[PDB]
Amino acid sequence: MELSSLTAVSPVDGRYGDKVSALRGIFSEYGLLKFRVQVEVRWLQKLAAHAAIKEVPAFAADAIGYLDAIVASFSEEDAARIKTIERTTNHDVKAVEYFLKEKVAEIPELHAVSEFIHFACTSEDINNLSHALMLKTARDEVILPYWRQLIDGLKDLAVQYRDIPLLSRTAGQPATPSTIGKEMANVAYRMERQYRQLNQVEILGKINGAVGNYNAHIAAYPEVDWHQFSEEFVTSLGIQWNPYTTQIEPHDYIAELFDCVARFNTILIDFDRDVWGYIALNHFKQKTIAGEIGMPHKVNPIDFENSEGNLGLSNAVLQHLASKLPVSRWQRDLTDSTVLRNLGVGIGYALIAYQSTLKGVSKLEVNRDHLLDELDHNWEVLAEPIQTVMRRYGIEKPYEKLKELTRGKRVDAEGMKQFIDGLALPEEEKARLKAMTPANYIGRAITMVDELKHHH
Amino acid sequence: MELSSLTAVSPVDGRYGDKVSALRGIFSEYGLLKFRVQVEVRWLQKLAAHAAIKEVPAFAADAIGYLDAIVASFSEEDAARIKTIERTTNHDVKAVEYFLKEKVAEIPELHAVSEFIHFACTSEDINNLSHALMLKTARDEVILPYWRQLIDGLKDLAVQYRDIPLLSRTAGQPATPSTIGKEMANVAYRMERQYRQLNQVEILGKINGAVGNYNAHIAAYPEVDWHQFSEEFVTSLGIQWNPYTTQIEPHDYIAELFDCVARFNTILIDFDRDVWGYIALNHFKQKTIAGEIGSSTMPHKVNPIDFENSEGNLGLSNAVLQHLASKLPVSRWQRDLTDSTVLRNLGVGIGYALIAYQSTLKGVSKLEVNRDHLLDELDHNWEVLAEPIQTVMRRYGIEKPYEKLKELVDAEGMKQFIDGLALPEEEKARLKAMTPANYIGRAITMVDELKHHH
Amino acid sequence: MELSSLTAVSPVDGRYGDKVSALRGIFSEYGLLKFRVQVEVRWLQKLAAHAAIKEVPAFAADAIGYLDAIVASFSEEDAARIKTIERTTNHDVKAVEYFLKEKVAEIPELHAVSEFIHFACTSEDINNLSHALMLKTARDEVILPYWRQLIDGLKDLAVQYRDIPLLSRTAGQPATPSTIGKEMANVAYRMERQYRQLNQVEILGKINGAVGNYNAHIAAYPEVDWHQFSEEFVTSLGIQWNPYTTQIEPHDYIAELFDCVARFNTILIDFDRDVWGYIALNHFKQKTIAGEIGSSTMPHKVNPIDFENSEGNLGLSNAVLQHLASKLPVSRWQRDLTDSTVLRNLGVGIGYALIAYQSTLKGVSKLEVNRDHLLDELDHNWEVLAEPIQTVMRRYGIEKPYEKLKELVDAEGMKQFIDGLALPEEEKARLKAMTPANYIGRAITMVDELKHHH
């Protein structure tokens, strides 16, 4: 069978292919080839523009334009030609070199310096810079924007539900109340920490030959400062320089990048699960779309579930790459090549999940009635504030007395109030206690939500 | 950009797409829909054949033939129709139900009972049996044949190199000799153990309604023994019955299946690495093809790229296989839907493995043992004869053997030492007759006896 | 600070030390040394009993008894002596060899053949058989008994709660009813499958010299059939023979063993989480002990801490078990020594599991089903009867059943709907007679039939 979204083995290009189309121009074989061509062309241009390298004279405006067009217009047909050349070479980067030599053969000025294409380079000089550009593009244009949407989404929920009381659950059991909004705010804050971290991760690149010592460069041009040339080239591409490497860029920064993405994904899994649970408890209802089919009565939180499942898959891939890539035998073994063709896979599962969560979030409808009704059936949670007040005014064995009263026992409002009336506390504090309810015993939850904007 | 092999995000459908084409008819959404159709059709057929279910009379030969053609000829076009319907329902199994109702509308016999399509079934009754069929098909038609190729490949190398001596390396250091063949035989034996295990793994399936108690079935047909009906149906599909489940089949067998595949893959990683090293030591050279380029900048290179490709994909395969094995069997209460999207990846872990198996086989086809180097290295490591000398000395009670050797080298040297030993000439001769190259123990016979085990 | 339960870095030897004391005589360094001694002793005993090995005459009854006592009475003191010797050799197995030579020096019969202790053996010949004995002992005496306790525990809960109805939750939402007992039976069935599997896992052992070819053995005793000698020895220890290995036993069976334990643990995590949730929903209350404190600040709390402790340790157990399973079977060439230190952790993964099993059993002992809540919740979810109504309507050809229900609730309501259906009174009555509480399908009978399967 020919490949189509229906026949694709992986759902990243299959069922959810439409959800990750942006990655097709980045992490696919076409994307890799597109970036490699960009790097190869920029290298030749630097050689030409470098005065000390006279064998490659400065290019005329038309030649530079022709080279820039090769880069800018790089097409699927172009990639197919490279793939056809690779049939012969069984070496993908050599095929890219030959492809560029073909494209250039018709331009005298360019054909004349044809043998300077890939001059002194090792395949990894091209590959690592391509990987850097792929990751930087994905982070800056795709990953961070979804993260910002998720953060803003969570913040909107926090504000929207800032004062809606919630019977908290610790160890799964009814506990000291909070607000739906505060619970959303905690998540936004954690996501923001990771956002900052991902944005600060260094994206490294190198260019130094076969094993990292500019051997071939120096052999031919011993008068050129290749170490400086390298730093200038990598930085000219918008990549940070990694001066010490073997044949490969060591990949530590990819682990750094993927580790932070996995941490964010982990926070999201925690979120997907919590919301699934709030929905299970009927604290939220879900909007329904006419014609759709959810047992004819059910409305399932499938969006959060789809996200949760894909986040687990995403992390499985990202962490394998993070832990396996930085280990390469001696000056390098080639096991990382095929693995690096999966940079987009881990990211793809994540993107699918981000969109699913956003879709699920858009359907949320808070059930204030149930939230309040549940709270009203759990007056035992007032045992904490009562005992804490007792401790303040020196009443003996406060925690112990409240434990005897509520642990494993059902106590309604009248029973809790009956207990308060029997305490030897100042009249004022006595009334203050009888005035609280599980619904209003929310501490600083609301102000906490309102102050979120002052952080980060 | 539109999806194509060149633009595919995953290399399983991209660069290596042509290496896993068989999986496109199994684990893809087309494959899932195809098997779902098979299951729905067989379910209706069983209802018809069941005499106690009079509302679905037995089907005549032509109608059965029409239903069988729906199953056997299921096309991408049919799959596309289901996807079109799903755009309305936002429910894939329900779309399959509607697709079938549409397909049988022209046959009055079938159209008359179209409402019994999916009767009393919950979506997972259809999904789990589809996953079982997908995994069974993959195992019997795809995975096991590659494993047999690898095993036979290794056995061929064992036989071919049965008597080629090798300076063994323990802790990476020169050690007691073996033969290339024996080292290959060790791998084939391990692969065979896993082969037998994968073949013995149970592939489970269930059918019992919404939460596993046949509630709906019993409500409409309380006189029918649905528990028996369930067992017969699952077994009729060639799947083993799992009588106790919630809404979902628990997935324990998927972990069992994936665990054995991962163990085999680990054995293969060990092989890819060891051979990579034998090539590094120049114990093996590799066949080359004119026109091919070993390296872009070092023209003299011939790299073991096939083994490295294999090794890399095996690590990836295991990472995915392991995640599915550990995550799938945990589902909240009577089930949460996180396993649905995850099960669309059953073929991903398998795909990386298939790619690796083909790469290893390609690497194996290029190996050219280098006897000259193997023998020359052995001839410069006579120190390995310290072991047999020490053991013989011990047999005859010579004091401090381990010490006299550990303390105290070429042939002449080792020859001088032996001569000065208090041993009978016959034994001295036997020791003076051995060389690193022939101090291979039972290596050759071990290879010849391999065929006698599994 | 000196090591004690309070200062131990790992909680397996620290806080939970008393929960895994049986493992201290198995997987610890004392345990490893103990088994190494057993193996070395049995090896010497076999040499003696072998008629072709005349340099080691058959041992008389008292000497055999002295050797057996060395094995059976091995103490921490003996272990300490070995460690003292190891300070000189920086080689643990060699220290064991010296320890034994010291121990038999007083018996002339044994002292006369002390040089044959460890004859022709490589350290791993001793280590692998020790690991096999350690794992077999752990499986048969420790792991399987806890698994039987869990399984029987779950079966007891299934029987005890066989007819207690439950509002099932799929995707966390109210769904077709089941019974608490049936949900427990599902778990016991899954645990049983893994129990049978762990019991069937092969525990392999080998003995064949430096690199697996009996080089040293054949050099000294070329007339002895060491391949036969090897098989007899390993099987005499109650271990299954692995005829093809390098210096090390490949460790594939350890992965097989750990994979089944991890699958069982995963089933248990699923159980710990589900029960945690049933307690959260108040379907179960928990027994309390006077004096105990549920929470430091919320006096009303009764937390499912036993299940949570279990769940946490199971995740840890699997992480370690999985690392050993995937890492141990890969060893450079004829072996690298990275597996040595790693195998000192065989008991770590197992220890976390044991702690978890005990915590779950403790949690189970405190459960008190809350029928009142379970029934009250069911009585507020009549919408679940939409399923059976729809299926009956379908049986009798009423058009658009799924639609009339999906589109269109308490008892009276559901009762009004049914009354307006074109069905025979007999069927209307059957539908009007069901309630969420009794719409449990075959749940009860499924529980009663469990005993009939495995």
Add this chain to the structure above:
Amino acid sequence: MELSSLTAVSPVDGRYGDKVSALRGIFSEYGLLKFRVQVEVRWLQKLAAHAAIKEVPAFAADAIGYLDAIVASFSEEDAARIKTIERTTNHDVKAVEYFLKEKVAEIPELHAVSEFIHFACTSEDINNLSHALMLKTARDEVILPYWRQLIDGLKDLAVQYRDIPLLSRTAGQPATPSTIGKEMANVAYRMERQYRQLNQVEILGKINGAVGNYNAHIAAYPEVDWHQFSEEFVTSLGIQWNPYTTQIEPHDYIAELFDCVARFNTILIDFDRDVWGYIALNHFKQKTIAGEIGMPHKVNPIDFENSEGNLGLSNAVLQHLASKLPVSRWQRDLTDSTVLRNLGVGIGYALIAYQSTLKGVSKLEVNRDHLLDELDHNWEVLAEPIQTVMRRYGIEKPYEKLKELTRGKRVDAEGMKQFIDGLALPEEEKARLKAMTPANYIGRAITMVDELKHHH
């Protein structure tokens, strides 16, 4: 059997117990209890010193000293008493509270405010700050110092072996040369990047009650700014403040801390493996200790192997904690409690490995003779520089000609020189080529080593 290093189930407290003794006073149950007592005492002292909280008057010098002594002298006997109290409570932090109330009963000024011990606190307020102090102590006093030793060790090797030629291996095959020192330098640089990152990881702490909203605090003292009180307290302990949490500190920073440790461990695994290989190739010999026993002839790199094995174990634990800890049901489930008792386990395996590598490094003895001899048998590596020079001076099909000459062929010095003599290149460049050898074709390797000090 009683617990001893011989009977311990885990080798962290068993065979290698002596290698991690520093962790016994930090991550063990004693350490956890020691830190909890510290936090509890500091909290009571802040309450007393806070003017607005009159029910807890400023403490006299002797009272403060008595409290400080409880903290400073905390002993194993003290921990045992807590463990004995825990027999009753089946709640470890409540036992700590009761323990402190007992210690204080004999001091009137302190006994008088006994019920303010643990005032308004939830167990996690004590636990998370204890975890923060444990990790900060381990990082600053134990982890970073071993990392510095490893970095300095690698740098010493780089300088020591700066000009020793090495036949590089890419894909395991002979390639463009480098120097032993340069290969060591690459590793030091990578380790330094992680060192910087670990040192910059935030160690977070919080204190805000049952579910994170100061409910109990505000119930008793609505006039006190508890949000400010919280920030002051956490910072007073030398911990960075985390203002938004549920009952638990979310643990994202632990994942951040462990992710960087795992990356460092991964670089070390790569190092242990590479050295194992250099030793296999006889590029290094190993020093031997009289009396020790290594087949009587062998000397095995057991130190690097022991390290490699423990690094894998370390990462297995660290990453499980990193990925599992930040996911907690609703306002928290208690599965993290038992897991956090293993913070020292992952670190312990790492420490064992660091010491093993250092031990192995101390035994290294470079084999210059073999390194040079091997290089002299691989003149084919000069194909790269020859073709690159040919490309410079416009000689047609340079790479192709060298490929025909060397790929899959054995070419000695005379053969390579014979080829150079036949090239149409300027006399000067012709001699330059005939002057190079595999041993001197090391590019910028030496200067690269010498310039390492200018980075970081």
